[PDB]
Amino acid sequence: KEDSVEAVGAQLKVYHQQYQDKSREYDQLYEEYTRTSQELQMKRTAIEAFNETIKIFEEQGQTQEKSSKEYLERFRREGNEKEMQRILLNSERLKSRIAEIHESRTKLEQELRAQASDNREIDKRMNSLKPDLMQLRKIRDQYLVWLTQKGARQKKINEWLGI
Amino acid sequence: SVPASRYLTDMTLEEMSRDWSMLIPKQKVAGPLCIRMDQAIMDKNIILKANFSVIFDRLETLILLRAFTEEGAIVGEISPLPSLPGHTAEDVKNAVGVLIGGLEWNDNTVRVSETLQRFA
């Protein structure tokens, strides 16, 4: 019968469109994934630059209080309160400045981690599409083979596929 | 790690759907499968390519297997019979042996795909 053949052909058409659609959905995700993945790479790199500056500053604060303890042994005997209250004030200049760049590193890192976490979600969404993609492709291929086996030529197959 | 579900496709849609003819038809029903080979092909190198699924690490279902010459021509096929309910992995392994044998009788050198080596 030429009716069972057109019915399968129509059903092939349905599965192929579904597969083209899931497949486009999949690749959209893949492209958003690879993109934010580069952005993450640029953030990590900027964080690395934050890290080395912060390093410098930390090993300078520890260098300006490693001598400011021994030089509260010449300035122990005083005790000025317009001059003695002033020599730990540049210790406060240095602390407020490590703190400030810490605040800035931590806001970058907070943004990076949230972004990384968003891309893991995209990866899950893709990974979730696979079983339907696989099933659909296979089933679309079985319809195609059944039509070949019943005498359909490539040109007719191609018309049902819409290609 | 191991999915324990995949659909392996050696062939493009174009290969699966291409029109082909046997100069000297040889055809045999192998359970639920159909095996086809051109009795006129001789002294060629042939590659068996297939589309099929796996579960576990094992072949589950054949969708289609076609035999290609080095020049890309189709000279044999294994396929499910459209009438009928399906087949097992074993029908599949037997149909392949039967086809390789048929092509070797005529002095063809027969290779199978890597996906086939691996699961089938």
From Swiss-Prot, chain A:
Signal peptide: none annotated. The modification Phosphotyrosine is found at Y30. It comes from the Eukaryota. Phosphorylated in response to signaling from activated receptor-type protein kinases. Dephosphorylated by PTPRJ. Belongs to the PI3K p85 subunit family. Heterodimer of a regulatory subunit PIK3R2 and a p110 catalytic subunit (PIK3CA, PIK3CB or PIK3CD). Interacts with AXL. Interacts with FLT1 (tyrosine-phosphorylated) and FLT4 (tyrosine-phosphorylated). Interacts with NYAP1, NYAP2 and MYO16. Interacts with FBXL2; PIK3R2 is a substrate of the SCF(FBXL2) complex. Interacts with PTPN13; dephosphorylates PIK3R2. Interacts with XBP1; the interaction is direct and induces translocation of XBP1 into the nucleus in a ER stress- and/or insulin-dependent but PI3K-independent manner. The SH2 2 domain is required for interaction with FBXL2 and PTPN13. Regulatory subunit of phosphoinositide-3-kinase (PI3K), a kinase that phosphorylates PtdIns(4,5)P2 (Phosphatidylinositol 4,5-bisphosphate) to generate phosphatidylinositol 3,4,5-trisphosphate (PIP3). PIP3 plays a key role by recruiting PH domain-containing proteins to the membrane, including AKT1 and PDPK1, activating signaling cascades involved in cell growth, survival, proliferation, motility and morphology. This is Phosphatidylinositol 3-kinase regulatory subunit beta. The lineage of its organism: Eukaryota, Metazoa, Chordata, Craniata, Vertebrata. The chain holds residues 431 to 593 of 724 of the full protein.
UniProtKB/Swiss-Prot annotation, chain B:
Residues 98-120 are annotated as: CPSF4-binding. It is found in: Host nucleus; Host cytoplasm. GO terms for molecular function: identical protein binding; protein serine/threonine kinase inhibitor activity; RNA binding. This is Non-structural protein 1. Homodimer. Interacts with host TRIM25 (via coiled coil); this interaction specifically inhibits TRIM25 multimerization and TRIM25-mediated RIGI CARD ubiquitination. Interacts with human EIF2AK2/PKR, CPSF4, IVNS1ABP and PABPN1. Inhibits post-transcriptional processing of cellular pre-mRNA, by binding and inhibiting two cellular proteins that are required for the 3'-end processing of cellular pre-mRNAs: the 30 kDa cleavage and polyadenylation specificity factor/CPSF4 and the poly(A)-binding protein 2/PABPN1. In turn, unprocessed 3' end pre-mRNAs accumulate in the host nucleus and are no longer exported to the cytoplasm. Cellular protein synthesis is thereby shut off very early after virus infection. GO terms for biological process: symbiont-mediated suppression of host cytoplasmic pattern recognition receptor signaling pathway via inhibition of RIG-I activity; symbiont-mediated suppression of host gene expression; symbiont-mediated suppression of host mRNA processing; symbiont-mediated suppression of host PKR/eIFalpha signaling; symbiont-mediated suppression of host type I interferon-mediated signaling pathway. Changing K44A: No of ISGylation of band II form. Changing K28A: No of ISGylation of band II form. The dsRNA-binding region is required for suppression of RNA silencing. Belongs to the influenza A viruses NS1 family. There is a cross-link at K26, K28, K44 (Glycyl lysine isopeptide (Lys-Gly) (interchain with G-Cter in ISG15)). Keywords: Eukaryotic host gene expression shutoff by virus, Host cytoplasm, Host gene expression shutoff by virus, Host mRNA suppression by virus, Host nucleus, Host-virus interaction, Inhibition of host innate immune response by virus, Inhibition of host interferon signaling pathway by virus, Inhibition of host PKR by virus, Inhibition of host pre-mRNA processing by virus, Inhibition of host RIG-I by virus, Inhibition of host RLR pathway by virus, Interferon antiviral system evasion, Isopeptide bond, RNA-binding, Ubl conjugation, Viral immunoevasion. A motif (Nuclear export signal) lies at residues 55-64. GO terms for cellular component: host cell cytoplasm; host cell nucleus. Upon interferon induction, ISGylated via host HERC5; this results in the impairment of NS1 interaction with RNA targets due to its inability to form homodimers and to interact with host EIF2AK2/PKR.
